[PDB]
Amino acid sequence: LKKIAESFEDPSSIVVVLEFILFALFFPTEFNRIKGDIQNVLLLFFSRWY
């Protein structure tokens, strides 16, 4: 993954989450390759939001 630094303080940070979802829809394969590296970002998103 081309790494994203994102704290997820602002609600707008949801954009990044959507950026992944779209990528997982448009490109399930390439996503499946980069997806753990995506999980590293998502874990920040969850620890902050949930």
Partner: protein
């Protein structure tokens, strides 16, 4: 003839993300604003996708 399963799926996704954003507690007033705007932007994303 009318329904596009892809677009409908993105509708449920954006609906979920919107209720996720809606439920997001925020401290600053500006965050409260971005929280309300993000939902509109989500709605826009949904139409663009459809």
């Amino acid at each position: 003839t009318v329904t596009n399963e892809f677009a409908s799926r993105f509708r449920t996704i954006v609906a979920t993300l919107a209720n996720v954003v809606n439920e997001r507690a925020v401290q600053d007033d500006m965050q409260k604003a971005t929280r309300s705007c993000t939902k509109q932007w989500l709605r826009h994303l949904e139409t663009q996708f459809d």
